[PDB]
Symmetry: C2
Subunit: 559 residues, 2 copies
Amino acid sequence: LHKVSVPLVLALQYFFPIFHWGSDYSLRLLRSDVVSGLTIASLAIPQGISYAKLANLPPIIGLYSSFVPPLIYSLLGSSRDLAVGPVSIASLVMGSMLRQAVSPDQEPILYLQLAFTSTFFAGVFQASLGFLRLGFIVDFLSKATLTGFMGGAAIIVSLQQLKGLLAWQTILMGVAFLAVLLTTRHISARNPKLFWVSAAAPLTSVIISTIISFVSKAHGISVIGDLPKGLNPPSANMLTFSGSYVGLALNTGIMTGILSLTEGIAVGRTFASINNYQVDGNKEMMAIGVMNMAGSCASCYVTTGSFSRSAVNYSAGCKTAVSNIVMASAVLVTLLFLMPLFHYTPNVILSAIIITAVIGLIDVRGAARLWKVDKLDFLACMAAFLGVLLVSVQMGLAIAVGISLFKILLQVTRPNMVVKGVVPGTASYRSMAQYREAMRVPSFLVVGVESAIYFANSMYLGERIMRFLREEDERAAKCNQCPVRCIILDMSAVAAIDTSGLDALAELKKVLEKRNIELVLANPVGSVTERLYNSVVGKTFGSDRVFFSVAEAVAAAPH
Amino acid sequence: LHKVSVPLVLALQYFFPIFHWGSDYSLRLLRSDVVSGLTIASLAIPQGISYAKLANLPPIIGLYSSFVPPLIYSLLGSSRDLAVGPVSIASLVMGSMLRQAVSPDQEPILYLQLAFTSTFFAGVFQASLGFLRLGFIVDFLSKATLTGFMGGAAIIVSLQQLKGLLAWQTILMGVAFLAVLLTTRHISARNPKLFWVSAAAPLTSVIISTIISFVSKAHGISVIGDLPKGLNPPSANMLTFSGSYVGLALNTGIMTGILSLTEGIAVGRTFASINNYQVDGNKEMMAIGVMNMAGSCASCYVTTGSFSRSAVNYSAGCKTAVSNIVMASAVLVTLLFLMPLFHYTPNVILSAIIITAVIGLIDVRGAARLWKVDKLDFLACMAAFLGVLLVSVQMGLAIAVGISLFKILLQVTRPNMVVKGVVPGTASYRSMAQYREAMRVPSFLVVGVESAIYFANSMYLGERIMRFLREEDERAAKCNQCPVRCIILDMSAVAAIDTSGLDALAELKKVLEKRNIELVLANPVGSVTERLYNSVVGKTFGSDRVFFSVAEAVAAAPH
């Protein structure tokens, strides 16, 4: 028999990780972060400007958002491969939530007061979700939920940019560079060695088209024009905590503060497992969020770790988070010296960078792939696609997160319970539905409940055991066999058990004792055994009714 | 090696179960249901009248509710021991939700139009929750939630009956029969053979006090007075589906239709396991709910299977649901002939039957017992106690059910993952925290995840395996041992797995292959093996990477 057991220097290093990994910084790591930082401050200048236009902001707000939030994260960040900048989904939702209350064309100054207050309210939401150690609710945002959302929100932006839109080389320069940017993101999606042609394609589209426009003073082509040369102007005089639009700037902060958090705490997770290092998650949510609310005071909008630039970062050989300093050192140059060179860049070119980032969100293949595999993840993909397209954008991320949390509760409530039997030649007791080889011991009924025993199922697992008990007490009467005299609960799959779960196991042990059947638990789990040996309802089982395995509960014969 | 496998006559019998169990009805079963039905139409007449006063209704509405809803359930019910009548918690919440919008004393006719419309809206909520096969959400109502609720709502009724209250034998007859009714429910709570003294004590209190009042024309004692002799008057002309109070009569229906359903689908569950028969649950929720909305048209209020009378039913020897006919045959007699005998029964006597049923709801011992065992079930008990006492009664059953559903999600997200080792002399691989005897195999790392692998945890189980992998690859360098060359996932406790869970197991198999570590699954569960052999992401594991047990995965040596 086997017994069942029970189970100021630090202040600038617990808050600022740059004093920890700054000790191992070589010049071989500076050669690797300069190449991967100048590769990444070549996808940041054209796509930061582009995603600021997608958020209906001035195009320099995306370049302000590639200087100070990359510098703040390099002080507070825990990931070596994460790249900080404006993000295509956070810009598309911010520019759709603020478009329908404040017009960006007629009220410009009021529009650059709710883009900065929403960034602050996204900052104080992300920071006060990792400070309260409450970051696991960004894992409730499934990949199926973010397929109908990004795709149900990529249409209502395409509809809003279809009402306000109503020459000829404007059409041809917007469709030629839509064929340079769409086939090249297909070349790099196939071969993961030609990443460099898609990292260079937005900057080459900006550079080449500016030549075909200075060479014309091309009329029939709009042009960015003069952009204000200099660093970030001090905001937080544009942070409106009082007025009519403080519930709109708050609704955009808890909306672009979630979608920016399911991208930055999902790309710091991706590259921590490839390169084998430890990222905290909650300290990463305090980093992205002090980044936002201190960038909100420096004329930036919502930034996080982008999916696209971080993959370019870990394809050019980044080693530390100094690739976010070399990024913000070629953004510092272009904010101080290279600003008159955007005077002839057309708006249709960085409208094509928007289109490849919008139709790169409409993923219909993986939404149809979500129908062949699961069907409650297809319901969550179509409750976000049809909850954003018809009803507001808040209730498309609430009726799809709520029914993704429901399919978890639909398995904890009403779980699978199986009748197990011994596999011949083996002391292992597997289920008798799977494993047709498994035959049953004559005077025993091995039942395995495959979930944690909570309040939500503890009365269902008492009416299912007795349905199992009624069937085998009637099958043994049709086959000249002995009745059930020991019910063994295989607790191998019981994750946890609460006070309503232990009480249902003691109101089952004494109901089965009146019919002389002797309930016995076998193979408990740690966090259940310490719940069973530290309770007054766990001494009604004791040491004679808790066993090492099912084969040891059969061999002891509790009768 | 062992292979892992994959897993009009009926129309009046599917709707009316009385045509099924009416075939075996003997006269020995009629002798047993008459004694247990007249025992139970002796606790129904005094406590039905009493709980109608607790709901601020006329006292005959509780006797109308003991005639037709017992007769409807005897046609549609599936439980042999369930007793149908008015219920102390459903009457206390109905009489508290309608008291604060409509005064029962100044607007009597409007008050007997929202007690009948709430019963209809409780009926169409209970019936259209078992017709949609949606009855598992009454299991979300924990026993900890219904301890702070019944006890946080038993005070705000005691407060409402303290404002409107502001002779001498009225005080003495209300305190003497409060000592006959409170000590006798303590005698029967100790010895479960003297149930008959607590079943007789409300009727004896009504009978004896009526003698001490006819013998006086006792002034200084209020008296029920003349009650309308006859059967149930036809309502549904008092069912108001249009007006100002249709959102109040609906709020009371989804509130007294839940609390009446967590008592009737919890006392038909209790007595189905003691007497070993099968109750459907959803067909039981269609029975209780056609019972309510067809009793609502016959001048009844919310009835269900009461906890107290069903225990008296299964202590006097009920065998079928004809104890609900003998109950409604001694209510038919007292509604037709014995109505002038309540002309001198004092209102303070059946106010004492209320008090023993209100302070029998305030269970402070099991609320303090909920602190020694769990602490997220004490939070749900004090979010219902302080969510009903301060904020409305809807948000005390919403912020306590919502944080009882949260502790389920707080275990599916972030579960327990253990490192397992072989117990010596045994081919069983238990965890190494519990079971200090368990030592590890040199070139292996057996990890057991103790939950279902969902979207909510699939990225947490990839950063915890590599934390387990980083520790044992560093411990083996401090002890002159071989590194980890096979990671075995013990899937013994994995209940289910979704498409985000299989994809995380294939984006872990190929990350571990680059470091030459060869991830292997062992002991899968049926509903995971059929999810793994019917997926394109389950053929990247195959038959060489899915094993019978952990000891067979070690013995095969996948390297």
